[PDB]
């Protein structure tokens, strides 16, 4: 059935926002335990950072194609226009999200390449005040992602 997929759908995007979350929490412990302190140091932690990003781009992903077939299955269903309305509002929403996701993760990983080039406290702590801005930001956008995704369950009915 179609309402079933959509049961589906919704507490698979959960799962992977929650997946999202915990990755930038290790990221953000782990770049706070660097900084509180070496080369090698900053090799590690770098590769650790550009793991949590890697993970992070594919779960990403995952949810954009979710996304899309979420999109595609509310389409098909025949919602009153009030409950349409409703749905229809929370998605551009979530677009909205999705895309200042997107965006914040490009800008990441171009911060990441760019201090990869570089040997050297003030330079690399001005490149941990950039992300830290951007992890926090995009800790931002998650819950309010979770607390989207909980508003569809309820405006449908599945909670």
Same mark, same amino acid.
Request: hydrophobic share 35%.
């Given at each position: 059935?179609?309402?079933?997929?959509?049961? /589906? $759908?919704?507490? =698979? @995007? +959960?799962? *992977?926002?929650?997946?999202? !979350?915990?990755?930038? #929490?290790?990221?953000? &412990? %782990?770049?706070?335990?660097?900084?509180?302190?070496?080369?090698?140091?900053?090799?590690?932690?770098?590769?650790?950072?550009?793991?949590?990003?890697?993970?992070?781009?594919?779960?990403?992903?995952?949810?954009?194609?979710?996304?899309?077939?979420?999109?595609?299955?509310?389409?098909?269903?025949?919602?009153?226009? /009030? $409950?349409?309305? =409703? @749905? +229809?509002? *929370?998605?551009?929403?979530? !677009?909205?999200?999705? #895309?200042?996701?997107? &965006? %914040?993760?490009?800008?990441?990983?171009?911060?990441?390449?760019?201090?990869?080039?570089?040997?050297?406290?003030?330079?690399?702590?001005?490149?941990?005040?950039?992300?830290?801005?951007?992890?926090?930001?995009?800790?931002?956008?998650?819950?309010?992602?979770?607390?989207?995704?909980?508003?569809?369950?309820?405006?449908?009915?599945?909670?």
């Amino acid at each position: 059935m179609d309402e079933e997929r959509l049961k /589906e $759908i919704l507490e =698979e @995007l +959960e799962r *992977i926002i929650e997946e999202v !979350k915990r990755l930038l #929490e290790k990221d953000e &412990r %782990l770049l706070r335990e660097f900084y509180r302190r070496d080369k090698e140091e900053f090799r590690r932690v770098i590769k650790l950072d550009e793991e949590v990003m890697k993970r992070s781009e594919e779960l990403l992903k995952r949810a954009e194609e979710l996304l899309r077939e979420l999109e595609e299955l509310i389409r098909r269903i025949p919602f009153s226009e /009030e $409950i349409r309305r =409703e @749905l +229809e509002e *929370i998605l551009r929403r979530l !677009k909205e999200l999705y #895309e200042e996701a997107k &965006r %914040l993760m490009e800008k990441a990983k171009e911060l990441t390449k760019r201090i990869k080039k570089i040997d050297t406290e003030k330079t690399l702590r001005e490149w941990y005040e950039i992300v830290r801005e951007l992890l926090e930001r995009a800790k931002e956008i998650i819950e309010e992602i979770e607390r989207l995704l909980r508003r569809l369950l309820e405006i449908l009915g599945l909670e």
